């Protein structure tokens, strides 16, 4: 019909999705109301300006932003001097989603830099001469896999990597993030991620790990950083994804988990929040929404017959709308929420989440939903590693040609 608004956020019923504070005001409701007011303006801007909405992903702008960053950054990124492999990963993966090729001179230059970041005793550091750390180690491995050349693969010292992992392993099943460092669920994920891709998993490496992760699920249904902590989208993604790698998803109560994450999508904004009664944020478009392809695959492996055959169990349309309308910077790059500044982290994960929302797949079934112009469609991403599904297969196959260190 002519009167029918094709955009979910702009329909008149949508106004009913605003916060109801029951006339009881607290810091939480006040802050939530501020955000909703700002998002409402974005939605209403087309009406007040008397224009028909058009949702366009600013590919060219984002490309320039990334292309430059891959070489040079302002001193605004001094606070990330210990996370430079992350910067390599975020930027390469963004380009990959946008389907932009990586010049071979760039690829070789990335490889050489990561070699300087690699520790003599295994793992990668945040920069040359810095001690090894599991987070930048995860980022480095992912970047080399995106590049995917023989040169890239050979950078990783597999013997030492395994030794490094062992030195971090705890008796209770967890891993330190680094020597003399802290423990939380992220470290289990980082370890499982690099260990599986490079084929260095021994019979005992992950003894007790699935059980320790299972202790992190709480009364909310989601997963916390350590046993006893509030459930959070970042830690929940890491936990489930690690379990999937270890083939132990069933150690969790998948049902309470599913109910928790689906509740994390904001009815008004359309994006995801990181925990109950906090604010929406573009990066959760991946950490939170990325859980649904994981649950689908897990529940299906248990023969769940009620599973939809064309959609993930979240509002794909509304998420795309939030990202496209609220999370783009006009000059290129993406962001947390309106009023916030762009950065390579949010560029990586907003696009990752967008891809998830565009692409559904379960064995033989395939179905896409692309909001706005068709040029918006991105390359797909793997829900466990957050790199191209092809790059995952390519890497795993290649390293399977080697024997697990020590045989």
């Amino acid at each position: 019909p002519v009167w029918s608004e094709p955009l979910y956020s702009l329909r008149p019923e949508h106004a009913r999705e605003r916060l109801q504070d029951d006339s009881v005001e607290t810091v939480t409701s006040i802050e939530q109301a501020k955000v909703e007011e700002k998002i409402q303006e974005v939605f209403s801007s087309y009406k007040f300006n008397h224009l028909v909405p058009r949702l366009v992903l600013q590919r060219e702008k984002h490309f320039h932003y990334l292309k430059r960053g891959l070489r040079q950054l302002t001193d605004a990124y001094e606070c990330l001097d210990a996370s430079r492999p992350w910067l390599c990963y975020w930027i390469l993966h963004s380009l990959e989603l946008l389907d932009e090729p990586i010049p071979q001179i760039v690829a070789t230059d990335v490889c050489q830099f990561l070699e300087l970041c690699q520790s003599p005793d295994g793992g990668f550091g945040g920069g040359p001469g810095q001690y090894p750390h599991l987070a930048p180690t995860y980022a480095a491995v992912n970047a080399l896999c995106i590049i995917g050349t023989e040169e890239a693969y050979n950078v990783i010292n597999r013997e030492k990597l395994l030794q490094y992992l062992y030195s971090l392993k705890q008796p209770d099943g967890s891993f330190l993030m680094h020597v003399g460092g802290e423990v939380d669920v992220r470290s289990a994920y980082c370890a499982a991620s690099v260990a599986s891709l490079t084929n260095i998993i021994t019979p005992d490496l992950f003894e007790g790990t699935a059980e320790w992760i299972a202790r992190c699920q709480n009364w909310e249904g989601g997963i916390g950083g350590v046993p006893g902590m509030e459930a959070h989208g970042g830690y929940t993604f890491c936990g489930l994804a690690a379990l999937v790698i270890l083939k132990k998803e069933r150690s969790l109560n998948l049902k309470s988990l599913l109910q928790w994450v689906t509740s994390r999508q904001m009815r008004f904004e359309g994006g995801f929040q990181g925990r109950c009664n906090k604010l929406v944020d573009g990066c959760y478009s991946f950490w939170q929404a990325g859980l649904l392809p994981l649950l689908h695959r897990a529940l299906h492996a248990q023969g769940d017959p009620a599973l939809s055959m064309s959609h993930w169990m979240f509002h794909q349309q509304a998420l795309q709308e939030y990202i496209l309308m609220c999370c783009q910077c006009p000059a290129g790059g993406l962001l947390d929420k309106p009023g916030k500044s762009r950065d390579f982290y949010h560029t990586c994960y907003c696009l990752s989440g967008l891809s998830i929302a565009q692409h559904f797949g379960s064995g033989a079934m395939l179905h896409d939903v692309v909001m706005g112009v068709p040029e918006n469609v991105l390359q797909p991403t793997h829900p466990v590693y957050n790199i191209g599904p092809d790059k995952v297969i390519q890497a795993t196959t290649h390293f399977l040609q080697k024997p697990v260190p020590g045989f």
């Binding site: 606070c79 001097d81 210990a82 430079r84 009364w219 689906t262 904001m266």
Partner: protein, 323 residues
């Protein structure tokens, strides 16, 4: 000595007492990637840090240098590691270092490194006597700080400081009953003290929650807590629950209350209740209302639930295909 923000601050390459050391430039290679254009101050401090790290110089002057390197980038875990080496090696007074770390956390409370550093100090000194009060101050500025709550749980658990936390929880719930971090802390305290098997305790907890729900029907935290403390034994184990919720439909309705009803019916159907079929249709009715009107953002979830209930609780569910 010389603060990093001092108007009279001087680069290290212009300091006499550092004249013997050659700075060590960063090795980024012949053609760098993700290269950061550091400021003068930054590059100067870290060129000198690389020198002392490389020589493993464990001196008073190196100790002071780590303060400046941390100030420039508190997320540099390598600098933090060296600093802890110097603390032990130089036999530095640890309460003085406590004074230092509390000031840094005050100004950068959302940093992993600083909280971990505080923990190591408390471990070394075996003294938690300042912790609850310090954390309270951080929570007074941001009542949801994840690192803060994590540190609080660690301290209480390791040193068995349970006796006053419930009182603290009640205070914060007063200020903001929507604070999910506080509801989590409430569950944390009770689980590790009396537990939820004590009927008097469980009874108390449910009354309070329902209370709060009555005061603020749309506050999701209270709903999740109520569900969380009853779901292990099974919702259907509590027959009075259903009617009492239905009695809030009139003037306390919410998509939350509707969703709870569906959870009760779901469990009922699982523990073979009376009126198998009557209960089913009630649930599918609600699953539809939610997916089409009351909670459309979750339409895909609610359709899945309704489809699941049908798949296993319909009168035809156990009937052979030949019948």
């Amino acid at each position: 000595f010389l603060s990093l923000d001092s108007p009279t601050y001087v680069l290290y390459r212009d300091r006499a007492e550092w004249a013997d050391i050659d700075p060590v430039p960063q090795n980024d290679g012949p053609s760098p990637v993700v290269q950061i254009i550091y400021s003068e101050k930054f590059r100067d401090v870290y060129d000198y840090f690389r020198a002392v790290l490389q020589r493993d110089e464990r001196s008073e002057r190196a100790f002071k240098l780590t303060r400046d390197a941390i100030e420039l980038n508190a997320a540099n875990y390598t600098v933090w590691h060296f600093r802890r080496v110097l603390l032990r090696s130089l036999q530095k007074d640890l309460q003085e270092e406590m004074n230092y770390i509390i000031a840094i956390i005050e100004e950068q409370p959302k940093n992993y490194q600083v909280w971990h550093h505080r923990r190591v100090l408390v471990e070394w000194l075996k003294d938690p006597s300042q912790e609850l009060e310090f954390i309270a101050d951080i929570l007074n500025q941001d009542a949801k700080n994840y690192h803060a709550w994590q540190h609080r749980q660690w301290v209480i658990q390791e040193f068995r400081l349970w006796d006053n936390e419930l009182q603290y929880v009640d205070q914060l719930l007063k200020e903001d009953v929507r604070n999910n971090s506080v509801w989590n802390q409430r569950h944390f305290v009770i689980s590790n003290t009396t537990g939820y098997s004590d009927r008097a305790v469980l009874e108390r907890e449910v009354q309070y929650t329902l209370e709060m729900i009555k005061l603020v029907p749309h506050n999701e935290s209270a709903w999740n807590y109520l569900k969380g403390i009853l779901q292990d034994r099974g919702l259907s184990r509590y027959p009075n629950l259903l009617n009492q919720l239905l009695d809030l439909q009139p003037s306390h309705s919410s998509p939350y209350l509707i969703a709870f009803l569906v959870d009760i019916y779901e469990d009922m159907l699982e523990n073979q209740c009376d009126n198998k079929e009557d209960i089913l249709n009630k649930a599918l009715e609600l699953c539809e209302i939610l997916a089409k009107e009351k909670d459309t953002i979750r339409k895909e979830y609610w359709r899945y639930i309704g489809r699941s209930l049908q798949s296993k609780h319909s009168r035809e569910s156990d009937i052979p295909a030949s019948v």
